[PDB]
Structure formats: C-alpha cells, structure tokens
CSV table of N, CA and C in Angstrom, one decimal:
chain,number,residue,atom,x,y,z
A,1,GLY,N,5.5,-45.9,-0.5
A,1,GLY,CA,7.0,-44.9,-0.3
A,1,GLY,C,7.8,-43.7,0.0
A,2,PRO,N,7.9,-43.5,-0.3
A,2,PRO,CA,8.7,-42.3,0.5
A,2,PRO,C,7.7,-40.8,-0.2
A,3,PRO,N,7.8,-39.2,0.6
A,3,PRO,CA,7.1,-38.3,-0.1
A,3,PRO,C,7.6,-37.8,-1.5
A,4,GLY,N,6.1,-37.9,-2.2
A,4,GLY,CA,7.3,-36.7,-3.9
A,4,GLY,C,8.1,-35.5,-3.2
A,5,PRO,N,8.7,-34.7,-4.5
A,5,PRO,CA,9.7,-33.5,-3.8
A,5,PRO,C,8.8,-32.5,-3.5
A,6,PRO,N,9.4,-31.3,-3.0
A,6,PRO,CA,8.4,-30.3,-2.7
A,6,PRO,C,7.7,-29.6,-3.9
A,7,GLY,N,6.7,-28.7,-4.1
A,7,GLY,CA,6.4,-28.7,-4.9
A,7,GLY,C,6.6,-27.3,-5.9
A,8,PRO,N,6.4,-26.8,-7.3
A,8,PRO,CA,6.4,-26.0,-8.2
A,8,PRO,C,6.8,-24.1,-6.9
A,9,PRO,N,7.4,-23.7,-7.6
A,9,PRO,CA,8.0,-22.3,-7.2
A,9,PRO,C,6.8,-21.9,-6.9
A,10,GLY,N,6.3,-20.6,-5.8
A,10,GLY,CA,5.2,-19.8,-6.1
A,10,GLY,C,5.0,-19.1,-7.0
A,11,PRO,N,4.0,-18.7,-7.6
A,11,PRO,CA,3.7,-17.0,-8.5
A,11,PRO,C,4.5,-16.3,-7.7
A,12,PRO,N,5.2,-14.9,-8.9
A,12,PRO,CA,6.2,-13.7,-8.6
A,12,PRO,C,4.9,-12.8,-7.5
A,13,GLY,N,6.0,-12.3,-6.9
A,13,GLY,CA,5.0,-11.6,-5.9
A,13,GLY,C,4.5,-10.3,-6.5
A,14,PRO,N,2.9,-9.6,-5.4
A,14,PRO,CA,2.5,-8.7,-6.5
A,14,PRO,C,3.6,-7.2,-6.6
A,15,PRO,N,3.1,-6.3,-7.3
A,15,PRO,CA,4.0,-5.0,-7.4
A,15,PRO,C,4.2,-4.4,-6.4
A,16,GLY,N,4.9,-4.0,-6.3
A,16,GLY,CA,5.2,-2.5,-5.2
A,16,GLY,C,4.5,-1.6,-5.1
A,17,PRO,N,4.8,-0.5,-4.2
A,17,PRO,CA,3.9,0.6,-4.6
A,17,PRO,C,4.2,2.1,-5.1
A,18,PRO,N,3.6,2.2,-5.5
A,18,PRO,CA,3.7,3.6,-6.3
A,18,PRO,C,5.1,4.5,-5.2
A,19,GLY,N,5.6,4.6,-6.6
A,19,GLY,CA,6.5,5.9,-5.5
A,19,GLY,C,7.3,7.3,-5.2
A,20,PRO,N,7.9,8.3,-4.4
A,20,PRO,CA,7.7,8.9,-4.1
A,20,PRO,C,7.3,10.6,-4.8
A,21,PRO,N,6.9,11.3,-4.1
A,21,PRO,CA,6.4,12.1,-4.9
A,21,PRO,C,8.1,12.7,-5.3
A,22,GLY,N,7.6,13.3,-6.5
A,22,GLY,CA,8.9,14.1,-7.7
A,22,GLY,C,9.1,15.4,-6.9
A,23,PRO,N,10.6,16.1,-6.9
A,23,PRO,CA,11.2,17.5,-6.7
A,23,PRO,C,9.7,18.6,-6.8
A,24,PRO,N,10.1,19.5,-6.1
A,24,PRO,CA,9.2,20.4,-7.2
A,24,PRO,C,10.6,21.1,-8.1
A,25,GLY,N,9.0,22.1,-9.1
A,25,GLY,CA,9.7,22.1,-9.8
A,25,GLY,C,10.6,23.6,-10.1
A,26,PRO,N,10.8,24.3,-10.6
A,26,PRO,CA,11.6,25.2,-10.9
A,26,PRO,C,11.2,26.4,-10.6
A,27,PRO,N,11.6,27.6,-10.0
A,27,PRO,CA,10.8,28.6,-9.9
A,27,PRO,C,10.3,29.5,-11.2
B,1,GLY,N,4.0,-43.3,-2.0
B,1,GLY,CA,3.8,-42.5,-1.3
B,1,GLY,C,3.2,-40.7,-1.0
B,2,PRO,N,3.5,-40.2,0.6
B,2,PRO,CA,2.1,-39.0,0.3
B,2,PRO,C,2.9,-37.6,-1.0
B,3,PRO,N,1.8,-36.7,-0.7
B,3,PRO,CA,2.0,-35.8,-1.4
B,3,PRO,C,3.9,-35.0,-1.2
B,4,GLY,N,3.5,-34.5,-1.8
B,4,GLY,CA,5.5,-33.7,-1.4
B,4,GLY,C,5.3,-32.6,-0.8
B,5,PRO,N,6.1,-32.1,0.0
B,5,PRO,CA,5.6,-30.4,0.7
B,5,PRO,C,6.0,-29.2,0.4
B,6,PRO,N,4.8,-28.0,1.0
B,6,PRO,CA,4.7,-27.4,-0.5
B,6,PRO,C,6.5,-26.7,-0.9
B,7,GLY,N,6.2,-26.2,-2.3
B,7,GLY,CA,7.4,-26.1,-3.4
B,7,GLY,C,7.7,-24.0,-1.8
B,8,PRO,N,9.0,-23.3,-2.9
B,8,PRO,CA,9.6,-22.5,-1.7
B,8,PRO,C,8.5,-21.3,-2.3
B,9,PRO,N,8.3,-20.3,-1.9
B,9,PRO,CA,7.8,-18.7,-2.4
B,9,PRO,C,8.5,-18.5,-3.8
B,10,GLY,N,7.9,-17.8,-4.3
B,10,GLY,CA,8.0,-17.0,-5.7
B,10,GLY,C,9.4,-16.1,-5.9
B,11,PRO,N,9.3,-15.2,-6.2
B,11,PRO,CA,10.3,-13.9,-6.4
B,11,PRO,C,9.1,-12.8,-5.7
B,12,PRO,N,10.1,-11.8,-5.5
B,12,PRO,CA,8.9,-10.3,-4.9
B,12,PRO,C,8.9,-9.8,-6.9
B,13,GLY,N,7.6,-9.7,-6.1
B,13,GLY,CA,6.9,-8.4,-7.1
B,13,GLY,C,8.0,-7.9,-8.2
B,14,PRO,N,6.8,-7.3,-9.0
B,14,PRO,CA,8.0,-5.8,-10.0
B,14,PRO,C,8.1,-4.7,-9.7
B,15,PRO,N,8.8,-3.5,-9.6
B,15,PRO,CA,8.9,-2.5,-8.6
B,15,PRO,C,7.4,-1.8,-9.2
B,16,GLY,N,7.1,-1.0,-8.6
B,16,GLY,CA,5.8,-0.5,-8.2
B,16,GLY,C,5.9,1.2,-9.3
B,17,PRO,N,4.8,1.7,-9.6
B,17,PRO,CA,4.8,2.2,-10.5
B,17,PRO,C,5.4,3.6,-9.7
B,18,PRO,N,6.3,4.8,-11.1
B,18,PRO,CA,6.9,5.9,-10.8
B,18,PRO,C,5.9,6.8,-9.8
B,19,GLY,N,6.4,7.5,-9.5
B,19,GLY,CA,5.8,8.2,-7.8
B,19,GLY,C,4.5,9.4,-8.5
B,20,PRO,N,3.8,10.3,-7.9
B,20,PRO,CA,3.5,11.5,-8.3
B,20,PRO,C,4.2,12.7,-9.0
B,21,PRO,N,3.5,13.0,-9.7
B,21,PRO,CA,4.3,14.3,-10.5
B,21,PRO,C,5.0,15.2,-8.6
B,22,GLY,N,6.2,15.9,-8.3
B,22,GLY,CA,6.7,16.8,-7.5
B,22,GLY,C,5.5,18.0,-7.0
B,23,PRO,N,5.6,19.1,-6.4
B,23,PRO,CA,4.1,20.5,-6.3
B,23,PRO,C,5.0,21.5,-7.3
B,24,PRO,N,4.5,22.5,-7.5
B,24,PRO,CA,4.3,23.6,-8.3
B,24,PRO,C,5.8,23.9,-7.2
B,25,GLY,N,6.3,24.5,-8.1
B,25,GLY,CA,8.5,25.6,-7.7
B,25,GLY,C,8.0,26.9,-7.2
B,26,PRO,N,8.9,27.4,-6.4
B,26,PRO,CA,8.5,28.6,-5.9
B,26,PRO,C,8.2,29.5,-6.8
B,27,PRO,N,8.2,30.7,-6.4
B,27,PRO,CA,7.5,32.1,-7.1
B,27,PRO,C,8.3,32.8,-8.0
C,1,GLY,N,4.9,-41.1,-4.9
C,1,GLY,CA,4.6,-39.8,-4.1
C,1,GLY,C,5.1,-37.9,-5.3
C,2,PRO,N,2.7,-38.3,-4.9
C,2,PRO,CA,2.9,-37.0,-5.9
C,2,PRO,C,3.7,-35.7,-5.3
C,3,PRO,N,4.5,-34.0,-6.2
C,3,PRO,CA,4.9,-33.3,-6.4
C,3,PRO,C,3.9,-32.4,-4.7
C,4,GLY,N,4.7,-32.0,-4.0
C,4,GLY,CA,3.2,-30.7,-3.3
C,4,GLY,C,3.5,-29.8,-4.3
C,5,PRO,N,2.5,-29.5,-3.1
C,5,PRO,CA,1.5,-28.6,-4.3
C,5,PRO,C,2.8,-27.0,-4.3
C,6,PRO,N,2.2,-26.0,-5.1
C,6,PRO,CA,3.6,-24.8,-5.9
C,6,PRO,C,3.5,-24.1,-4.4
C,7,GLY,N,4.2,-23.8,-3.8
C,7,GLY,CA,4.5,-22.3,-3.2
C,7,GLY,C,3.9,-21.8,-2.8
C,8,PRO,N,4.1,-20.4,-1.8
C,8,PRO,CA,3.5,-18.9,-2.1
C,8,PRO,C,3.2,-17.8,-2.4
C,9,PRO,N,2.9,-17.3,-3.2
C,9,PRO,CA,2.9,-16.0,-4.0
C,9,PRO,C,4.0,-15.4,-2.8
C,10,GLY,N,4.8,-15.4,-3.8
C,10,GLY,CA,5.4,-14.0,-3.2
C,10,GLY,C,6.1,-12.9,-3.1
C,11,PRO,N,7.0,-12.3,-2.4
C,11,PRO,CA,6.7,-10.8,-1.8
C,11,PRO,C,6.5,-9.8,-2.5
C,12,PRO,N,5.8,-8.4,-2.2
C,12,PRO,CA,5.5,-7.4,-2.5
C,12,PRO,C,7.2,-6.9,-3.1
C,13,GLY,N,7.0,-6.0,-4.4
C,13,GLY,CA,8.1,-5.9,-5.2
C,13,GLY,C,8.9,-4.3,-4.5
C,14,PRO,N,9.6,-3.8,-5.1
C,14,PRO,CA,9.8,-2.8,-4.2
C,14,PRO,C,9.1,-1.3,-5.1
C,15,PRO,N,9.4,-0.1,-4.0
C,15,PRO,CA,9.1,1.2,-4.6
C,15,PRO,C,9.2,1.5,-5.3
C,16,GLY,N,8.4,2.2,-6.5
C,16,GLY,CA,8.8,2.9,-7.8
C,16,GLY,C,9.8,3.8,-7.7
C,17,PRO,N,10.0,4.1,-8.3
C,17,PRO,CA,11.3,5.6,-8.6
C,17,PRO,C,10.4,6.8,-7.9
C,18,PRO,N,10.8,7.8,-7.4
C,18,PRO,CA,10.5,9.2,-7.5
C,18,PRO,C,9.6,9.5,-8.1
C,19,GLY,N,8.4,9.9,-8.6
C,19,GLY,CA,8.2,10.9,-9.5
C,19,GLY,C,8.7,12.2,-10.6
C,20,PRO,N,7.8,12.2,-11.4
C,20,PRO,CA,8.8,13.4,-12.4
C,20,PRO,C,8.5,14.7,-11.6
C,21,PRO,N,9.1,15.6,-11.9
C,21,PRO,CA,9.5,17.2,-11.4
C,21,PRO,C,7.9,17.7,-11.6
C,22,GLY,N,8.1,18.8,-10.5
C,22,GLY,CA,6.8,19.4,-10.8
C,22,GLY,C,6.3,20.5,-11.5
C,23,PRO,N,5.2,21.2,-11.6
C,23,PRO,CA,5.9,22.3,-12.9
C,23,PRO,C,6.5,23.4,-13.1
C,24,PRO,N,6.3,24.4,-13.3
C,24,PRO,CA,7.0,25.4,-13.5
C,24,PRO,C,6.4,26.5,-12.1
C,25,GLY,N,6.9,27.2,-11.4
C,25,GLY,CA,6.4,28.2,-10.1
C,25,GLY,C,5.3,29.0,-10.9
C,26,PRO,N,5.2,30.0,-10.5
C,26,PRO,CA,4.1,31.0,-10.7
C,26,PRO,C,4.6,32.3,-11.0
C,27,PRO,N,4.1,33.0,-11.6
C,27,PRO,CA,5.4,35.0,-12.0
C,27,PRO,C,6.0,35.1,-10.8
C-alpha cells in the first residue's frame, strides 16, 4: 500500500558552547 | 506499504554554559 | 506502511552569556 507517514522529530540538539569571557574587574 | 520517510530534525540544543570570568581589573 | 524513522539530532544551542566580572585589580 502507501508509504507510512514521516518518522518522529529527532532529538533536541547538543548544548551550545561556553559563553565569552566576562568583563574586566574594576580597578 | 514501505516504511515512511525520516522525521524532521529536532530543535536546537540548550544554551551553553556561562563564559569564564573576565580578567583582573587594572591597578 | 510503518512510520519512518526519527529525524536527526537537532542543531547546536546558542552560546552561553558572557562570564562574570573579573576580580578587583591589585592595589
């Protein structure tokens, strides 16, 4: 008969990367 | 009928960790 | 026809936010 429907959504992706360095401390 | 097509990609992953601390302030 | 396979793992997440402030400067 006809093809079945598309599969389920895949898994959520991997975490994003570590953020940028923070700002300098005060004098 | 044949097995169906692949499902769609899952969503983007979670945000990455906070970045590292900034450097020491000026003198 | 059986449901197709699951979709692929999703894309990476976004970067984390910038890190905390650096430590106070030296005397």
